[PDB]
């Protein structure tokens, strides 16, 4: 806490503060349990080791356990994390979810509606742990959001907590309000209590077709998640404890009419996509081969941002001072104003997002942009324009069939570690039957020094540049163009 | 294949040059390295122009990027995948392969540890009885005789036995069990080293040897017992009678194979009972016999828990080095420093002396032996001083070849070696849906005589073996806990 460190260096102190932040009451789900470390003896050992860790030593964390310290050198990572199957330490609460959903709907606006959702109605369902960000993301893009949700207490949570403007139990009341806001081109979110399987076919039936259409119900879990059509919450739960065979069947049967309504709304001209809740697979498996007529949001909207290297870039103010983040908020406005969805994001975040634990911001920045911003941030820490160091961090239908290749995140971890990232993480997991994933993340500390400035320049070129190469190698034009445009060295091109 | 050879480099630096020479050494006839010939030419072209502060990335044999890094980073990072698609499931590196010296000295290491544990440090005056002269089994005769022992090896294929004699893996052969037996006891009495291949089926020969009162000092097996349809030959069948049965009636073959293996294993239990030091050499024979109802099949140990695991606990492992000059005398000079500097370790020094007579170089001259924690960095520095002085004609490549939660360790090892300044680092990802996945990591470091290389050698030759000790100390092995505490390895959770 504050402007002075208890550890022997600011990277070790950042690790301590990010670790402690992960179990902050306003950041964590159940901080008395979950996981930042394997168990509470490992947690205490990590903290004790980070306070006495020297500036030329490196701590190894092996699935949450501090297993060893080795002498390395001052420009090596102070920590290397390989966890099996979640602590890469830079979770910043709900702002990651909100801004990632903002970004999807921001690309949907650029591709189809002139760079804003003003005058459109997005129709979706599910306001749960991730779905509840949908209405704020849509309204922050200027749009009208109608969100169908079966649990009134989830609509009330999103309203009480300012993620949702209003609600109604009446579909034609929800409809008459959405059309008003669309005609006035006003931003407005309405939660309609109701079942997507029942409501969406009633909309197609009655002529209505939204401009944008997704879903974020728990369709990936047709027993404990998706409520089947014709069932109240208490009726559904009494069938779920008793007769899960005929629950999943009704649940899969209801997912089918839901998607057939989405398919029908797609032919009337709606821009419509899947949001990772596995809902086409369950509908095809129930008997509609057309299910994949609409695409997933990642191949449709995120992948092209990855082709120019753009990715979630986060930074945390270790001082615990919100003005540190407001100062770095302006520098994004001064120098990425050609990207107005990004500048619109910073201003709407300043007014809608509250801080949780350490003040933090996230937004998307491409190749070239990240190193630029890390260099400016590091200078302001050195001058004292910022009160203490900044933690900077970053936590699939591929053209060429390359979905399963684990080589890329391993080269990413290896290359960021060799560049002098402050800590590097690799999470890996899978086995027989369900496959294998690997993900690498990285943190770099901007502590004001000239040595940090060299590592910052290396690591913030290398991390986005390898995402560009990964997509250029897979044959994406925009990535081959970006690589040539920006000077990235590809021996085969 | 474009030659790069001798005392001069064509690349901007000697790590880049070493990568070229090791890349080409793997494609040597007397010994794939890239994805295809087009990737091979781009790697070679890129390595010739690669600067000393740049790093090349190889993704599954293909050079995909060069990035500015720094002079103490690896010049090459390699990440390779060999995934088998689900449908292909039932159909059953760091550029440092150095031929069959690896398999010969790994097997020597097993029988040297048996000699340390049970026969006072030598196999002179002992008979080891084994079976299988195949791709790995064929190294057993040399590994036993180089340890001073007599070796009697049963093998069903007579033409396979003659190829081992033709090729200096085996001293002699016979189809007479009594001739083989009188030759082996003769040599045991004279304490002479001798290997004898007997043409025979181990499931017939071993039961007979138990009946005649013959007992070996040491007993193993490297038959193909892991594959009872296509590997193990059932008792009573010639190779031709085995191949006809294999194809016509698979289930009768498998039943005779498994029941022969039960017979084979029961005879090994009978010799262990009468005093043979006996162990499993990774061929699944105990488990097949257990599944056939031999309830005491696991009453002899597997070779790694019994002999190799304790060497890993003290950090000891395969340490290989390659003379980039091509001069076999670069290797013989570094052998002499093993003989002066580790003269305490008798089986190491005996290995070096016997290797100079018995191992022929394949491709670039190279040596393998097992060195542990502390010993590797000490050897690494003397070699770097000898290259600096011109006592070696060119730089030396030093390497450790590749050989969920288990997977954390190779990832930390790769990340740690990269950060310490390994010259290059490789991660291999293998397996598929339907069989599970594996990760292996290797590294190379080049001793080029510079002060910058000396600092990287000190870090990397310390972190690579220290991590294997820590893995064993964490898992509860007292030998590894003792090593961590004596050597000062920093382990935050230990005691
Ligand atoms: N890959 C991504 O970036 C990404 C992002 C956001 C969401 N998702 C996916 O979307 C899904 C939702 O995630 P979550 O964390 O919000 O799940 P959640 O379980 O917390 O929320 C699902 C919501 O759907 C509601 N619901 C269930 N049946 C309904 C029905 N028939 N009609 C209307 N509402 C219904 C539930 O009451 C709940 O509020 C998950 O599959 C998630 O993986 C993926
Ligand atoms: N895990 C390890 O480090 C390790 C090391 C060495 C060997 N092994 C195991 O040892 C086994 C042998 O390996 P390999 O590569 O040499 O196999 P391989 O197929 O080349 O050779 C096996 C040999 O067994 C012989 N054979 C089959 N039935 C026989 C019988 N009834 N009596 C006598 N000989 C018989 C064959 O003729 C053949 O030459 C394998 O199962 C291997 O996995 C494991």
Alpha-carbon distance of B193 to B195, in angstroms, equals: 7
Q: Which residues pair with B277 in a beta bridge?
A: B218
Q: Are residues A37 and A108 in the same domain?
A: no
Which method resolved this structure?
X-ray
Note whether B75 and B111 are same-domain residues. Answer: no
Q: Which of B204, B481, B292, B489 is nearest to B373 (CA)?
A: B489
Buried b / exposed e along A261-272 (16+ C-beta atoms within 10 A): bbbbbbeeebbb
Residue B428 in tokens: 């291999």
Cα B226 from chain centre: 19
A-B contacts (CB, under 8 Å): 193
Q: Which residues contact A413 (CB under 8 A, 6 or more apart)?
A: A424, A425, A426, A440, A442, B411, B415
Q: Ligand 2 center to residue B77 CA distance, Å?
A: 35
C-beta of residue A406 within 8 angstroms of C-beta of residue A436 = yes
CA distance B237 to A407: 48
Interchain proximity A72–B419, CB inside 8 Å = yes
Give me the residues of B, 75-114, that contact A with CB < 8 A.
77, 79-81, 83
- A229 CA from centroid of ligand 2 (Å): 62
Give the closest ligand to the alpha carbon of residue A219. 1
- How close is the Cα of A4 to the center of ligand 2, in Å? 65
Question: What is the rounded distance in angstroms from the CA atom of residue A400 to the CA atom of residue A446?
Answer: 38
Query: What residues have CB less than 8 Å from A157, skipping those under 6 apart?
Result: A132
Tell whether B62 lies on the interface with A, counting CB pairs under 8 A: yes
Same domain, yes or no, for B421 and B281? no
Question: Can you spell out the DSSP letters for A435-448?
Answer: EEEEEEEEEEEE-S
Residues A432 and A327 in one domain: yes
Per DSSP, the three-state class of A20 is helix
B125: buried, middle or exposed (CB in 10 Å: 19+, 13-18, 0-12)? Answer: middle
Report CB contact under 8 Å: B404, A66.
no
| Closest atom of ligand 2 to CA, residue B260 | 31
Q: Are residues A25 and A137 in the same domain?
A: no
Residue A127 contacts residue A217 (beta carbons within 8 Å): no
A403 touches chain B (CB under 8 A): no
Mutation site for A-interface testing, chosen from B46, B58, B64 by largest number of A Cβ within 10 Å: B64
CB nearest A80 (choices: B405, B415, B462):
B415
3-state helix, strand, coil split of chain B in percent (to 5) is 45, 20, 35
CA-to-CA separations, A38 to B468, B469, B471, B493, in angstroms, rounded: 21, 21, 16, 12
Same-domain check for residues A209 and A78: no
Pairing of strands A271-272, A311-317: unpaired
Q: Which residues of A touch B85 (CB under 8 A)?
A: none
Pairing of strands A57-62, A65-71: antiparallel
DSSP state of A29: S
Element (H, E) at B366: strand B366-371
B343 and B241 assigned to the same domain: no
Q: Hey, whose CA ends up nearest to atom 43 of ligand 1?
A: A277
- Record the resolution, in angstroms: 2.4
> A492 vs B83: CB contact, 8 Å cut-off?
no
Mind spelling out the 3-state secondary structure of B246-312? HHHCHHHHHHHHHHHHHHHHHHHHHHHHCCCEECECCCCHHHHHHHCCCCCHHHCCEHHHHHHHHHH
- Do A287 and A355 have their domain in common? no
* Contact between B320 and B373 (Cβ < 8 Å): no
- For residues A254 and A297, membership in a common domain is answered with yes
The ligand 1 atom nearest the CA atom of A195:
32
Contact B46 A491 (CB under 8 A): yes
Residue B264 phi, psi (nearest 5)? -50, -50
Residue that is last in its domain, among B316, B342, B360: B316
Question: Residue A189 is inside which H or E element, if any?
Answer: strand A188-193
Chain A residue with the nearest C-alpha to that of B49: A491
Same domain for B472 and B387: yes
- Cβ distance of B414 and A410 shorter than 8 Å: yes
Last residue of a domain, one of B316, B345, B366: B316
Any bridge partners for residue B424, and if so which? B76, B444
Which chain A positions have a beta carbon within 8 Å of B70's beta carbon?
Answer: 75, 418, 458
Q: Which helix (H) or strand (E) holds A383?
A: helix A369-383
> Which of A310, A326, A361 is at the close of a domain?
A310
A466, burial (CB in 10 Å: exposed 0-12, middle 13-18, buried 19+) = buried
How do strand A212-213 and strand A271-272 relate by DSSP bridges? parallel
Residues 6+ apart with CB under 8 A from A273: A108, A213, A214, A294, A295, A296, A297, A300, A301
Rounded CA separation B65/B16 (Å): 15
> For the purposes of burial, counting CB atoms within 10 Å of the CB of A378, is it exposed (0-12), middle (13-18) or buried (19 or more)?
buried
Q: Hey, which residues does A489 pair with through a beta bridge?
A: B66
The whole-angstrom separation of Cα A473 and Cα B65 is: 10
CA distance to partner chain A, nearest, from residue B248 (Å)? 33
Residue A429: strand pairing partners = A437
| Residues of A belonging to the active site | 363
Instruction: Put residue A119 in one of left, alpha, beta given phi > 0 → left and psi -120 to 50 → alpha.
Output: left
Do both A318 and A223 map to the same domain?
no
The owner of tokens 């949570």 is A157
Q: Residue A232, class by beta-carbon neighbours within 10 Å (0-12 exposed, 13-18 middle, 19+ buried)?
A: exposed
In terms of Cα–Cα distance, which of A60, A23, A35 is closest to B493?
A60
What chain A residue is nearest to B73 in terms of C-alpha separation?
A418
CATH code, domain carrying A187: 3.40.50.10730
Task: Give which of B415, B416, B465, B481 to mutate to test A binding, by max A Cβ within 10 Å.
Answer: B415
Q: How many domains does chain B have?
A: 2
- Residue B436 backbone phi and psi in degrees, to 5: 85, 180
Which ligand is located closest to the Cα atom of residue A223?
Answer: 1
CATH of the domain at B476: 3.40.1770.10
Q: Is A313 in the pocket of ligand 1 (CB under 6 A)?
A: no
Residue A348 has φ and ψ, to the nearest 5°, of -65, -40
> Which residues, in sequence order, are bridge partners of residue B198?
B154, B174
> Cα(A354)–Cα(A222) distance, rounded to whole angstroms?
34
Establish whether residue B32 lines the binding site of ligand 2, counting it when its CB lies within 6 angstroms of any ligand atom: no
Which residues in chain A have Cβ-Cβ distances shorter than 8 Å to B53?
none
Q: Are residues B322 and B311 in the same domain?
A: no
Domain boundaries, position A227 = 93-310
Cα–Cα separations (whole angstroms), residue B56 to A490, B11, B43:
10, 14, 9
Do the beta carbons of residue B379 and residue B338 sit within 8 Å? yes
Mutate to test the pocket of ligand 2, among B107, B113, B129, B134 (most ligand atoms within 8 A of CB): B134
């Amino acid at each position: 806490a504050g402007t002075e460190r208890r550890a022997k260096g600011w990277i070790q102190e950042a690790a301590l503060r990010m670790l402690n932040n992960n179990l902050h009451p306003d950041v964590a789900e159940r901080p008395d349990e979950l996981k930042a470390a394997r168990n509470w003896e490992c947690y205490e050992a990590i903290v004790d080791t980070l306070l006495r860790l020297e500036n030329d030593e490196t701590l190894l964390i092996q699935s949450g356990k501090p297993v060893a310290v080795f002498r390395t050198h001052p420009d090596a990572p102070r920590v290397l994390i390989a966890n099996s199957n979640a602590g890469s330490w830079i979770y910043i609460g709900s702002q990651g979810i909100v801004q990632g959903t903002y970004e999807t709907f921001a690309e949907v606006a650029r591709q189809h509606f002139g760079g804003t959702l003003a005058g459109t109605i997005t129709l979706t369902a599910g306001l749960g742990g991730m779905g509840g960000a949908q209405p704020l993301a849509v309204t922050m893009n200027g749009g009208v959001c109608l969100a169908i949700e079966v649990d009134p207490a989830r609509i009330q949570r999103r309203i009480d907590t300012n993620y949702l403007d209003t609600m109604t139990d009446s579909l034609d009341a929800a409809l008459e309000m959405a059309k008003q806001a669309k005609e006035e081109k006003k931003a407005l979110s309405i939660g309609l209590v109701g079942n997507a399987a029942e409501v969406l076919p009633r909309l197609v039936e009655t002529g209505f077709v939204p401009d944008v259409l997704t879903d974020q119900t728990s369709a990936h879990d047709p027993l404990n998640g998706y409520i089947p059509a014709g069932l109240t919450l208490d009726e559904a739960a009494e069938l779920r404890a008793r007769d899960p065979k005929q629950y999943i069947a009704r649940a899969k049967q209801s997912i089918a009419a839901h998607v057939r309504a989405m398919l029908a709304m797609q032919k009337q001209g709606a821009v419509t996509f899947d949001y990772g809740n596995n809902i086409r697979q369950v509908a095809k498996d129930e008997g509609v081969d057309d299910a994949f007529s609409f695409p997933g949001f990642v191949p449709a909207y995120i992948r092209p941002l990855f082709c120019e290297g753009k990715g979630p870039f986060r930074w945390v103010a270790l001082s615990g001072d919100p003005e540190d983040i407001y100062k770095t908020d302006e520098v994004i406005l001064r120098e990425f104003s050609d990207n107005e969805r990004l500048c619109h994001w910073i201003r709407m975040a300043q007014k809608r997002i509250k801080f949780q634990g350490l003040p933090a911001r996230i937004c998307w920045l491409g190749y070239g942009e990240r190193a630029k911003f890390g260099k400016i941030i590091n200078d302001m820490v050195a001058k004292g324009e910022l009160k203490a160091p900044i933690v900077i961090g970053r936590d699939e239908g591929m053209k060429d069939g390359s979905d399963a290749i684990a080589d890329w995140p391993i080269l990413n971890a290896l290359l960021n570690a060799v560049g002098g990232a402050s800590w590097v993480s690799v999470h890996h997991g899978g086995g027989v039957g369900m496959g294998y994933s690997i993900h690498a993340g990285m943190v770099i500390v901007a502590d004001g020094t000239k040595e940090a400035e060299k590592r910052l320049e290396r690591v913030l070129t290398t991390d986005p540049g390898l995402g560009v190469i990964r997509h250029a190698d897979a044959g994406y034009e925009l990535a081959i163009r970006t690589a040539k445009e920006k000077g990235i060295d590809m021996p085969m091109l």
